[PDB]
Structures are given as structure tokens and as C-alpha cells.
Symmetry: D2
Subunit: 488 residues, 4 copies
Amino acid sequence: QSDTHIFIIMGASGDLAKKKIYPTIWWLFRDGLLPENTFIVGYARSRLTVADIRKQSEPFFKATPEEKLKLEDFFARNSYVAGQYDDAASYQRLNSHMNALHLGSQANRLFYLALPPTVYEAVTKNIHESCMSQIGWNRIIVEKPFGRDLQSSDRLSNHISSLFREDQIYRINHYLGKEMVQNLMVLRFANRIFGPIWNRDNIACVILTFKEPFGTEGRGGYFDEFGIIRDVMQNHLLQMLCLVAMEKPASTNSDDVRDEKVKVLKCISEVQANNVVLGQYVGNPDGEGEATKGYLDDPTVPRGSTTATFAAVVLYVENERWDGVPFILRCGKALNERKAEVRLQFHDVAGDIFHQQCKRNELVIRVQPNEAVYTKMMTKKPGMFFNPEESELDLTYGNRYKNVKLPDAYERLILDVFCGSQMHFVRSDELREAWRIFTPLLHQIELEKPKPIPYIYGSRGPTEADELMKRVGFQYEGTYKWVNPHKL
Amino acid sequence: QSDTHIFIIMGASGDLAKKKIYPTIWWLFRDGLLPENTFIVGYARSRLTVADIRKQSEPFFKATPEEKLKLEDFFARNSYVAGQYDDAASYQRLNSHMNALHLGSQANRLFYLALPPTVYEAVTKNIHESCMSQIGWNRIIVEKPFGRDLQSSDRLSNHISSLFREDQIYRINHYLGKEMVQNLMVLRFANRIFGPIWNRDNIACVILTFKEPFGTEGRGGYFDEFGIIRDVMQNHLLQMLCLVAMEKPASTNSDDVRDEKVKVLKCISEVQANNVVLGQYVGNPDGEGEATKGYLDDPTVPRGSTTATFAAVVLYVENERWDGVPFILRCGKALNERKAEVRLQFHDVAGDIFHQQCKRNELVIRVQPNEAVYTKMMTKKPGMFFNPEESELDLTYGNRYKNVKLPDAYERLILDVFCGSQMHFVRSDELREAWRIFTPLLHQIELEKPKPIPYIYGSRGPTEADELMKRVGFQYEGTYKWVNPHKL
Amino acid sequence: QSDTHIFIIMGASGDLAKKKIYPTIWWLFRDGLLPENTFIVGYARSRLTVADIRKQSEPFFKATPEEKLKLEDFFARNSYVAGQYDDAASYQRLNSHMNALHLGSQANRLFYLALPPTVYEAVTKNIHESCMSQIGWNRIIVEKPFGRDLQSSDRLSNHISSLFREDQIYRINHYLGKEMVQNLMVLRFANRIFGPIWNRDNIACVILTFKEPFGTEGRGGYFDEFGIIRDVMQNHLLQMLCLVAMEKPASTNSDDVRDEKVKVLKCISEVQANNVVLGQYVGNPDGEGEATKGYLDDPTVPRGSTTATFAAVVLYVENERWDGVPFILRCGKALNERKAEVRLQFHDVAGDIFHQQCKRNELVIRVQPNEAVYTKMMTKKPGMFFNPEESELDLTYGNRYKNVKLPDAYERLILDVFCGSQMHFVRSDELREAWRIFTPLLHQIELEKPKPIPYIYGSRGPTEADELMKRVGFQYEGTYKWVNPHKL
Amino acid sequence: QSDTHIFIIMGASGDLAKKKIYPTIWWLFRDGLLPENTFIVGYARSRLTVADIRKQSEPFFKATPEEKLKLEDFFARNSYVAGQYDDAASYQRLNSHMNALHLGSQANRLFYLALPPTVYEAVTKNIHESCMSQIGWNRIIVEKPFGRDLQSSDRLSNHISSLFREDQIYRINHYLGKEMVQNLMVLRFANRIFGPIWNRDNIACVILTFKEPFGTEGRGGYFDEFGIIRDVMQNHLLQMLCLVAMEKPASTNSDDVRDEKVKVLKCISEVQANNVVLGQYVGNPDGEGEATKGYLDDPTVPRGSTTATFAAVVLYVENERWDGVPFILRCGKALNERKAEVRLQFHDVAGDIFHQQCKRNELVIRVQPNEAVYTKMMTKKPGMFFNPEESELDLTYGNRYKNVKLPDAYERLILDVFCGSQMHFVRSDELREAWRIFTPLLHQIELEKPKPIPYIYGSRGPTEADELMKRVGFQYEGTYKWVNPHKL
Ligand SMILES: NC(=O)c1ccc[n+]([C@@H]2O[C@H](COP(=O)([O-])OP(=O)(O)OC[C@H]3O[C@@H](n4cnc5c(N)ncnc54)[C@H](OP(=O)(O)O)[C@@H]3O)[C@@H](O)[C@H]2O)c1
Ligand SMILES: NC(=O)c1ccc[n+]([C@@H]2O[C@H](COP(=O)([O-])OP(=O)(O)OC[C@H]3O[C@@H](n4cnc5c(N)ncnc54)[C@H](OP(=O)(O)O)[C@@H]3O)[C@@H](O)[C@H]2O)c1
């Protein structure tokens, strides 16, 4: 028997919904990964219909004429109910609609909250009081941002947890659904070539990089109140840090993984102001179009803002595995490229017998783009030479695994929610540790409003970030030359 | 000032000379790697001339019309002197010819003994007594085979050492001049990713493979008296073992490397007859041409020979790094392919949390063909899967370094002799250890003449070799699927 | 300000109370380790008084005439209330007595349940419903045994947890209060000489020994229904195993320690019947008095009982640290001595250069008697000898720290409860893992009633236990000679 | 058959001979450790007899009336021959005397050179040319000092090696014959508890201490020309360093051990002047007798000497095991005590969970006095405390092994020479490395004559030595309290 499933989309008319969630569920249904008895219900304030949502979401489905019948079958199982985020009557209407659905009484209900943070409390309380299935499971999905600091996030987390259990709350960090971020676990705990060296005795520093080649691009008002830290460093880079630095779990069960992650998080001291390099991007007079403007050139950005669009932060995990190893979280918008990457710079080889011509090994795990794992290693120079040179042992997805289509992170995450897997989701205690690590720094920056180091649009950011990386132990040489091969 | 150099080729009319040595020295001169004042003198019994040697060696030089001037200059500095390997008068004639050479009195003399083993004693004693330069250095080059067993090789080694010092003797193992064999040292002692795991706590077994897709191909008389063991296992695979298993030298000086190599050799017990699988190839009735005949089908092979053309031998290095780790030396002619390869099968990862679907890591260093270093590692299955799958972190020379032309092993070895580097040459004590490891097994096989396990031409050899590998700890699964990529 | 404290002793007239608890609290008060405002209330069915309890407990206080005034001051703060374990009115009487106490409304209440397991449910429910302090904390103490198997213990643990939180429940394992058992943590995680070797790469096997030189000595009816396994192996040896095998906690906080302990417990498979050696002691006809009788010679033991008084069990912790290392739990009553001991037999040293006359290192942590940590190590034979001999690096408490009086385990445990430290107490999940490890074996033994291997009273137990230890990897040589020194 | 042996003592009338060598050979004969056919021949310039040598050496034999018959039997096989150290005729006389001995033609001859360094050349050349046995082996013994610097020692070492082989030369470093110095090898390579931690990843610094509670005590002329460095640091502390830092040999054969020792020596850079603290002791006015005078108060010491009687030197072994670990060689005369000691201060435990009250582990190997191995370790404070405290796991010879009489170093060394064991003797290349390590520093001090830091007689030496130790990484706390136990 196949259990009936319901996919309730809160704020179905929203930007995030029509841009990512509806295409995600359509792709999941298209490949037959959803349960056979799966229905999708849209819920928002706007008085739209199934046809209106269909027309709004078609340009993002990327459908083909060979999938027309699947398209109508998918949309024949779609529904929309208009209502309010605080009026209960709309929620009893939604419950009645779900019960009128085929075998909806025992159907598994799944709620996605694609709504602004201001309405999460009301939506969760109303769902818990009115829209809970009595037979099948009920799992709710909440979306970034998770509060603004330790106390603001803690209050919302406690209100949500007071209503739902930890096995019902699914906090989205869509980078946890990335292919390479999930491959991190297999890399670490399935291979003997990465086990004995994953410690402070061999790793000199850890660099977690997040780059965007574009700035806030017009809508700077939303980014002004958060900044680069709360936007990227607190969640994406920090969860990447947790996965890189975690101990081996007792099993691949979700609870063991999240226990290891929170154990690593609990061993990080609060961020010191002397380990932070903040930058705010200024326009490039040689820039092309959008590159000509800076952050202050956005009309929606209030005048005289000190919000940082670049950050370089050094963290330390005071445990027996990571004692003294700097964890450099370097993120920034309007940089020279787009890149999410894990870089492990290893220590110098002891007893160097190659006359200082060797350089530190670097295991690099590039999450995006061009998913690839390569380790920067010293090989003998090809040809009639004896000196070592920097090379790599490279595994590049998209060349080794061309026929395999790496799915979107949202697809995999929603499939995990359907399957009940909670390994790649944020637990409450992880959120508390993440916010308490960065809260003193955020409060100090807010109260002191320090001036960031301006960096030209499209550049690599402030040079003081490079100075900080050099000071804390990271070695940059610039002599590594890499060429994309051909005619294999 | 550039010192004058002389390249004396003993047995200049020989097969090895005209096939490899003269092209090697021509290539070295062509790229300007030899000293500017370098002359080459040919010496053999046949009454040939410089023109005759030129005509005989041209089809192997692979010269081009753009190099006619360089070829003429190279051959203008070539000379030939006919003589005998036991008559002194010919050797005083050669000495007078070398003195009549431009600044030959202080010229550095280098002797290559491209001669059968039966004349090494006479040639070396005559060279020491008559053909020694009094000002420049004198380095002699002796060639495989080095004796037949412990005592036969020991007598020749002691006789040669009684005439020349260890810094004057250059024992050729042309696999030590291979690109990847020399890259072994950089891989091991220049990278922190291969240091903590290069021990018995992580490596389950070591496999050293030598394969040829052809048999003795007509000239089986020479191979009958030696067999596959003395031909390949005693020198090539064993030196590969020494380089893989050695401790880190104090420096890249030759003496430290050879001390580490002999220290590793001294820790290997004698080969037990129960760890050896011997095979002799029989023709394939479905074979194509030369594949239709077996070893016994060669007319020059004496009737009823039990010589083995395949061998699988398990060795143990009883030291603190390699205690209990089997070193499987598996070599064989008339196999399914040509391949020289170092394979390190690592242990199972402790505390397997992936439900036994992970497999042992394998670091593979393929010496030939298609020089490449790759480590077989477990990555998360690309796509909508969570199970780990076997993959590789691959560095392939000829794709990453296509423009770089990897030189011949003889070129690099002769350049090392010219430069005085003795790291990649066989020391006397290394030869003694190599012969004492295998001598009891060879004597037992000779005195007992056991019947080898026949294997069809072009196959993988006897299946009892795979039984031995499975018994000693090596795990073969056959589920590793690899595809060569394209359009990078 | 010093908060008022109340020490409520349930079953104050009981054997355990008057033998251990009242002397323990008297010793704690005598040294001034209790809070200044501390009162002790006795509660049981018998209609006794403070004077009667005083007279009954004096022979176990070991008081001296120099402590008379402290004795009356201690007993002036003692009180007794008679009642029932199921009648509520007695519990309101106890609550009224506690409120009539000096500042008892806000006093911290501590309950010790020195009662048989049959009444824990009623006592705990009545305490929760009637005897809870509304201002100060309330911590309850429950005593061994914790159920009989997985389900019987689970029902009681769930019932108690339904009434009290994990920070209010204090499960007693008095071996966790032992000096050396607590020193285990400092030994493991405060010293760099015991960190890199505390893993499967160096430890061959782990032996946890519990010996008693006496049998059930008359009261065999209580031991018949439990046996040696439930009595000792399930709690004492298993908690010793957890402390030996645990990972390093994030901090010395109780929750981190108990998380590591339960993580280790979760990695142990269920006990296989082929790894168990069971013995039941038979009398020694050469025995002296009590030693002349066997277990079947006890009149209170039912005829034809197969209960085991000796056990040797091999356990395996399938994690990355302890994969494949046998954990031998060997316990038995009526053995040749009394001894609780942790023994870590290390692996043979790789690359043995001493011609096989070295032996495995053994780090021994003797909990009782004569508390001592010594590591069995190979030193050069003193005198004119070159061979290594077994010796030890010994630290013996009572010789190095003779002036320091090592306190009783109950004293330290009750002081920890007073201070709110819960590191050395059994958590609910630890109990679940402990019972699920041994439940199938206990059920199989009960349903199959196998005949144990008889062993003479005062002997070392069945020899099949030593066969099992030899089979699983433990090496016993018997050549270790030790002499107690003198005149330092 | 027992081969005849001859013990030739050059300079038999000398101080070293009559104080140490004759008692040593008497003790060796008394216990029956010498070969049965062993004779001793004395050789010096003075015209003495066997009776005169007997009377001169009796006060140092420590004989007893129960050993009279053994004493006459020992002296009945003693002989004396007077001669010259350069006249050959005396050496032919000695040879004729040795041949007139019972079966002296094939007797094994052993020469001890208890002579000043000025006559070693003549004595060795004369012994090689005249006093070499043609049947039995001939082993010569040379004594400290071995030259004054690199070139002065190298000339003598090359001259001796030109006459005798390395298996015939026995260079005495009597600290290599000490009990604990020889126990170092068993400690390191027979125990798994000292193997994984004997590296730079766990050891913070190495301290080698040599202390004497007395100064030059009158005969300062001999010490003036050498100083504390050449006297102690170059040989005793440096050989202790070699044994501590060596790699595991392939076997217990002498050649493998000496190869490892020279390999370690070759990895030390020359001593920098900024890592040296030099002191010269000044008298203590509150002094006792000899303690009232300083080094300058010795009449035989030339006025205005800058010779150092204390030294603290930091060395570095740049290899893969000891990269960056300081090796502190701290020696000094007229200090507060006598002590030769190996101290290994380990690194701080990573991820300290004990709030910084733990301290670095120290493995201490006290060579003299009161031979003992103990490791300073952190144990839980005995009693009602939870904080860790410094303790030790102690093995003290003389308490564990009272009945065993630890022999003199000279006894064991001479027994090794008789048995042909050369493990505990200085090879030529070891001497070259030892002298090249310290030669630039010695030459700089000699040419610059810097003023040492005066320290009062009987003190701990200059405080700048403690500043240097603190600067290079060594941590001194002074909170370690140790008490000698009693009534075991
Ligand atoms: N790229 C992304 O957009 C992105 C990425 C990651 C996370 N998220 C998170 O996903 C959630 C979805 O937001 P969004 O990106 O879709 O922004 P949005 O388009 O502004 O919000 C989507 C829906 O929220 C409702 N809404 C808007 N303003 C509201 C208000 N003041 N009070 C109550 N409801 C309101 C609207 O419902 P009606 O149409 O019914 O009025 C709207 O359709 C956000 O919390 C966002 O932080 C978004
Ligand atoms: N692929 C290879 O050929 C190869 C590979 C590795 C090592 N080697 C070694 O290199 C050496 C060169 O031998 P090769 O391969 O050139 O074989 P080869 O052609 O038979 O021998 C070369 C020369 O040796 C001389 N020679 C032959 N038989 C002789 C005899 N009975 N007495 C004295 N001299 C004799 C001849 O000199 P004249 O012409 O002046 O009579 C001949 O020109 C051999 O020892 C071989 O083991 C060869």
C-alpha cells in the first residue's frame, strides 16, 4: 500500500514558491520520486487559482513537449486555497479541503513555509492547532532567515519547538542539500586516505569560501539589515565547517550526525573583533553596467550605511582534533567570481629533504560551480627535472559523471523530508550554537558601526583579509599553475 | 670551463647498443643535455666504422630533416675502435685513441658495458688496468643480468668492487629511470597526504604488477635459463618494492636513499615455496598468429621444460612499518596486456557506518603505459543516491602534461651518470639482499622441476595466483567501473 | 547565605540504610562537607525513633571519643517519621514534618530510596505528588537493581522519567564513585602518554575483572534470581567498559560525559552465546569452613539450579576506535581473591628486534584493593644481561599517598548529589543500552537452563574461560614475576 | 674449547688504569665472566712489577677475605712489561712476552689505551706493526678525549682507521655502558606504550642534564683547555641524544644501531651562538671548604680565563620525527647536585577540558644516581577532590631490584669488547658528526673569549639558562611535589 501524501505550500504566490518550490515538486513528480498518492495544495493571501499558479510557474518548470501528459497529471493533482496567516477560519477551510481530498484523513501532511519571518509564529501555531493530521505524520518546513541574533532566533526556535517535536521540524539550509556538501561525509568516513590526516597534527588551516560575482543588484534594503555575516557566514559556511570538523557518527542515522555537528559547534569560542575583516564594495568606474555602481549607489540603501559585503573571520574549535587550527570563513559579494569551496591547507612536511621547494598540500572540495574534489599535491616535475611541482589528483563531476544529472539541492532536501531523513537539516541546538558564536561580534559591529574596507566591484575584496589569512597561518604562494586538460 | 667527456660504448655493434644506447646518446646531445665537450667512442669486435654504425643506428634515431646539422655534428664527434675483450693490445689502442682526442688526457671517461655477462670480468679488469683516466673521473656502467643466484652474482659483484669503488659502479635497472618510479619518492616524502597512512596500520596489502601481452616470441632459449623470476621479479618489482617500502632518507643524496633501500631489503625473509604460483603459457587455438603458439611450441626451447612465464609471490618486510603486510609480486609474460603498476590496497575503514557497501581504498601508481597516479576512493553516488561508490582522484600524465615529453628511462639514467647522481642505481648490498631473498626458492625450483600451472596465451594467468592473493589478504571485487572522460 | 538541605532516607530501618547510608552521611557531616543547614529525615514502616536508629547505626559509624560533640550535633539534626510506601497520609505527614523543619519551605530536598525494587513505583509517584519542594531543587536517588531485563527495566525507567527529569534522577552505581574509576577520566584525557595509544591500532584486548573470594554465603535465594551477570556484569564491569572506551568529552560537564558513554554503549552488538563461559562453584572438600560448601549446598537455593556464579564474556565495540578489539568481561564469586581491575593488553610491538622474548604491554588500573595504576612494560634485565624482562611503572595509592584517606564511594556519590554533579550516575539511555546488550543472552540462558562448568570453591573458575580468553586474542604467559619492595 | 685471551693494558701505571681498569678486570674475573684462558699484561714506562701493581691497585679492588684464593689466581695470571711508547724494541719485547704465554700464538689480543692523547698515534702504529696476533682477533680500545675540534679529532680518527678496521676500534664512552643508557633501547623499541608518542607530534622539548656538585677541585689546568662543552656535551649528552632520538634499527646488531645513531647525528645543524648560555662558577663566601673557592681561585688556572663550567645548548634534529623539537643539553660543574637524566617534556594535551590546571607530561629516565624511570603524569587528586595533580608512574632500580647489583659501566663495556659487541661504542662517523656540530661554536668562543655568566658555587647555574629553556619552549612550573614513600 502507498500512503497518501499532501504537499501544502504556504505563501504559494510568493517569490520563493514560484521560483524554486513548484519547479522542485514538479521535477520530483516527473522522475517518479514522490509517493504515488501525492497531492499538492497551495496556500497564500492572493485570490489565485490552479490555472493562475500554473501560468506563473511554467517559465521555471523547464518542461518539454514530451512531458505534456505528465504535466497535466501533475497539475490535475494541484490545488489552491486562499486565506490569511492569522485568521483561523481560513485554516479550517484548508483543513476541510485537505479532508475532502482522496484519503486525506490518513494522508501524510507536509507543510512548506515559504513566507517572511514575521508570520512564522502565527502560521506554526495555526497549523498546530487546526491543520494536524491525526493518522499520518506531519512535518513542517521553515526557511532562512532564522532570527537576527542569539535571543531573536532563540525566541522563535523555542516557540516553534513548543509546538512541534524535533522530528517534525525541518530547518532548511539548502547548502546541506548540495551534492559535494553531502559527499563530504562519504569522503571523510568512507575512505582510509582521509582519516588519519583529518586532524590538527596534519592540517594547518581550514578555509571556507563563498563568493558571488554580483552585489545586492538593486534590492539592497533587505541585505542592509542582515549583512554578509548573517546572510552566509552564520549558516552556509558554518554548516560546511561543522561537516568538515565533525567526529565520525555512530551510524548514518540523522540524530548521530546532528549530535556530532552540535558537539563540534559547542567547541567554538565567540568571534573576536581582531579576527574579522569587513568590506563594503564600491563601484568600478571601469565597470560594465551593473559593475559601475557600488553598494552606496543603490537608492534603496539608506545613506551612510556601514553594512559589510565581505567578511574574513578566523574561528577555532578547541577540541583534541582541531586545537589551534584556524578556520578561515571568507565570504563576500560583488567579488571576482562565484564559488563555494572547502580548502584544507595541510602543514609543511616535517624533515623537508627537497630544499624548501615543496609546498603545503591542499585538499579542495569545490561545492559550486563545476563540482570537483582535488588535492593539491607535490609531484616530480614531468620531463628532465628532479624538482617537485604542485599538481592535483582531480575528480571532477561533469566529466567523470556526465550522464548523471546532479539534481537541485531543493529537490534532494524535499525528497529527504518525504522519506523522513533529517540528517541534512538544522537542529535547534545547532542554531543556538551558531547564533551564540557570532552574536557578540554582530552586536559590537551594530553598536560601533565601524567603517568597512572599500573594495572595487569585481575585485577579490579587501587586502586586509589576505593579511589576516597570512597572519593566522594560511600560506598563499600564487605559484600554482593549473590548465584544463583536453583530448583524453 | 666545460670539462671534456668521453662516452665509451663497449660492444658498440651489439643489439642493445644500436637499439637503445646510440639513440639515447643522440637524443641527449640533440637537446643539449650533454656537456659541450662530449665525444663518443664505439668499441666492439666487429671491424666496423663510424659510417657503418651510423647506417645501422639511423632507423632508431627517429631524426628529422630539421636536425641534419645536429646529426652531422653528433656523428662528427663519434668514433669506433675495433678490438678484443681479453687482448690488452686492443685496450692500449683504445687508450691511445682516447688520448689523441681533443683534451682527452683530463677528459671524464664513461664506460657502458653493453656486453653479455660472460665477458664482464675481462672487460672490467682490462678497463681498470689500462683505460683509467688519471685526472677526470671514471664511471663504469654494467647491465642486467647480475648473476644467476646469490653466489654467482656475489662473485661477479665482489670482483667488480675489487676494481672500482661504489661511486664508480653504475648498475642499470632501467625501471629506476622510469618517470613514475622516480615520482614515487616525491609522492611519498613531499606530500603530507601520503605520509601518515604509509604503514601497516592502514595498508592491507601491496601488489606490484608486471605484465606483457607477448611471450618469449621465438627466442625462448635465453628466457629458459632465467625464467620470469630472475628476469623481472628479482630486479624490477623488487626495486619498486624497495622504493614503496623505504623509510624517509636524511636527504636526497644518493647514499641516504640507497641506505634506506638496503635497510628495507634486509628486513625481508626468504621466499617460501607455499607463497609462489608458477605458470607456463600454452598456446591459444583461437589465437591470432603468434598467440596460437605456447612456450613449448618454440623450437629453441628444449623439450620438457618447466620454466615459469608467470609468477605470484608474497613477501613480508618484518619491520615496524610493514609487519604482516603482504607484498604481492605478480609478474607474467603472454598475459592480456602490458602494465607496470604499484597498487596499495588499504585496510577496511574501522567502524563502517555505511552497511558494508564501502570498499578498500587503493592508491595506484601506473608506471606504464599511460603514466598516471590515481587513488581508488569511495565517493557519494552522483545523483539521487546516498550509497557510496568507487571512484578515483586521478592525475594522468599525457593529459595534464601533454605538452611535456616524458623522456626514455635510458636517457635520464645516462644523464644521471653524466651528472654523477647515483640515486637510481643498484648498490652491491642491494644486489646481495635481492639475490639472498630469492635464491633458496630458485634452487628448490631448479632441483625439483615442479610443473607450472598452464594458462592460455593472452589470458590473465593461472587462477591459483588469484587464490593466493585472496588467501594472503588481498580483496578483489570486480565491481569497480571506470570510464575514460572526454570534452573537458 | 547557605541554603537549607534535607536528607530524606526512605527505608531508614533497612539493611542498606543502617549499614552504609547513615554512616556515609555522618562521615560527610563530620568533615564539614555537607551544607551548614542540613537536616536528615528517616522514613520507613517500622515505628522507630531517632534514638533507636542511633543505637542501631552506632556500631557502623566508627566514631571516636574526640568526636562526641559532633555526634550529638549530628543526631540533634536527625529525625524519623514512620509511614507506608503506598498510603498518601503518611506522605503528607512527612511533608508536614519537613515544612515544620527550620526553613524547610525553601529547603533543598534529597530523597534516597534504600528500598526493594518492588516499591519504587509507589514511592516515586507518592514523592512526586506530595513531597516536592516548590522553591529548592528535588533530587531522587534510586538503587540497584534496575530491572531484570530490557523490558522490565525499561518499564520502571520510563515510569520514573515520566515523573522526574534527567537532572533529578540519580541512579546509583557505587563503582562510579570509586577512586580509580573516577581517576580513569584524568588518566585518559589529562595525559598525552595515554592518548595516541588508546585505540585499536595498539590495544589487542581489554579485560575487566571482578573477583570475590566468597560465594553467596548463605543468602543464595536473592542471588539465584539474578546470577553473576545481572549482579555485576551488567552494571559494574559495563560502566568500567564505558569509561575505558569512551571518546573525549567536550567538557567535564555531566551531560557530555554521559553522551560519550551512551555513544560507546550504542556501538556494542548483542552478546553471542558462543562467547560466554558460565560457571557455578562447587564446594572444596579441603576447604576451610565456609569454603567446604558449594552453591548447591545452600539450603535456600532451590534444588537443581543452573545459576552461574562465574562469567567470561567477550564484547566488541564496532566503532573506528575499538573495531575488532575484544572486551573480555570476566567476573565470578567464590574465586581465589577479591579484585576489581582494568587491564589493557596492547599489541605485539611491530618489527620485533629482540628475538620474540618481548611480551605485550599491559596497562593495569586496579580499582580495589590497594588502589594502583601500573603499566606492565619491557625493561632491560638489570645486571649483566641484555634480554628484556617484564617490569612495571607503578603508582600505588596508600604508599605514594598514605596520609590521604581515600573516602568511601557512597560518601563521594552523595556529595556529588548534594553539589548537583551527575557525571558518575547512570542515565536512562545508558541503562537501555546496557540491558539490550545482555537481554537476549539472559533470555536464552533462562529458557535453555544450560549446565555451568563447576569450579572448586576458592579456585580461579572454569578453565574454559581461559580457553575463551586465549581464543579471542588475549595472551597469558605466567612468566611475570612481581615482588613488593621495601625500605625505600 | 675455550680460546686463549690476552688483556694488554697500555699505561698500566697510569691513574685511569689503577683506578678503574685493573679493578674492572678483577671484578670480571671474580664473577667468572671472562674466558677461562684469560691473561692480563701490563705495559707502561715505569719499571714496576706484578707485585708493585698489585699493591698499588689493592685499595680499589674492594676484595674480601672470602675471595683470597681468587685474588692470588687472578694475580698469578697478571704480568707487567716495561717499555716505551715510541721505541719498537719494547714492542717486540712485549710481543715475545705474549708469545711466551700459554698458547699465546693463537690467543685473542685486546689492547686498552689508558694513555694521554699525545701518544695514541705512536702506540697504535707500533701495535699494528708489531703486536698483532695472526690467528685470533685483535681489538684496540681508545679513550676520551677524541681530539679537540673537527679537524684535530678527524686527523687522529683517520690515522687510527688507516691502521685498524671499524670492527677492531672500540671508542670508549663509558656513559654508553651505563645501566639506564642501555635500557633506553629496550624502553623505546620493546614497548608499545613509548612508540606512537616518541615523535614531534607529542614531545614539546627534550632536556639532557649532566650535573656535578663539585668543580674542577684543584686540577683546573686540564679542564681549562677543554671546558664543559668538549668534556661532557660533545660525548655524553650527545650520545644520550642519539639514543633518545634514533630510529628503530633493523636488528639489535651493532652496525644497525650505529647506522641509526649516525643518521640522527647527520640531521643536526651546527650550534648557533644565540642558543648557548655559558657560565663559570665563582666561590661561595657562605661556602663550605672547597665550596668557598671559585674557578678563578684555582692557582693552576691561568689568570683571566673565560672557560665555561656550565652550558645550556638548544639543538634541533631537522627530520620527519624531530622537526622543530628543541633538544636542550644542559650541563654544569659545581652545581647543586650530581645527576645524569633524560627528560622528555610532552606537549599540552589538545582540547584541555580541565580548565588549564593540567601540566605537560614528562617521561624522566634518571641515569644516575638512583637509577629510575618515571613518567610525570596527571592523576586525579586523591581524596575528596576532582582536580588533576602531578604524579608519577615510577620504576626505581635499587628498590624493585635490590638483590641485583648493577655493575660498573667499565665492567659491562669490557665484557662487550670480549664478546665482540660494538653496539655501545663510538663509530668514526659518529665522532665526525659530533665534532662538526659543535666546532663552529667552539672556534667562535675561543676566538672571541666571551665572558661567561658567573654563578655561585653549589647553585643551579646562570638564570639565563632558565631564560633560554623558557624561550625555546620548555615549561618549568615548580609546583611538582614528590615524596619518597615508606612502609610498602
Ligand atoms: N531566493 C529567495 O527568494 C529565498 C531564498 C532563500 C530563502 N527564502 C525565504 O523564503 C521565504 C519566502 O519569501 P520570498 O522569497 O517568497 O519573498 P516574498 O515573495 O516577498 O514572500 C512570499 C509570500 O509571502 C507573503 N508575504 C509577503 N509580505 C508579507 C507580509 N508583510 N505579511 C504577510 N505575508 C507576506 C506573500 O503572500 P501573498 O502573495 O499571499 O500576499 C508572498 O506571496 C522568505 O522568508 C525568504 O527568507 C527566499
Ligand atoms: N633488449 C636488450 O637487448 C637488453 C635489455 C636489457 C639488458 N641487456 C643487456 O645488455 C647487454 C648487451 O647485449 P645485447 O642485448 O646487445 O646482446 P647481443 O647483441 O648478443 O650482444 C651485443 C654484443 O656483445 C658481443 N658478444 C656477443 N656474444 C659474445 C660472446 N660469446 N663473447 C664475447 N662477446 C660477445 C658482440 O660484440 P661483437 O659484435 O663485437 O662480436 C655483440 O655485438 C647484454 O648483457 C644484455 O643482457 C640487453
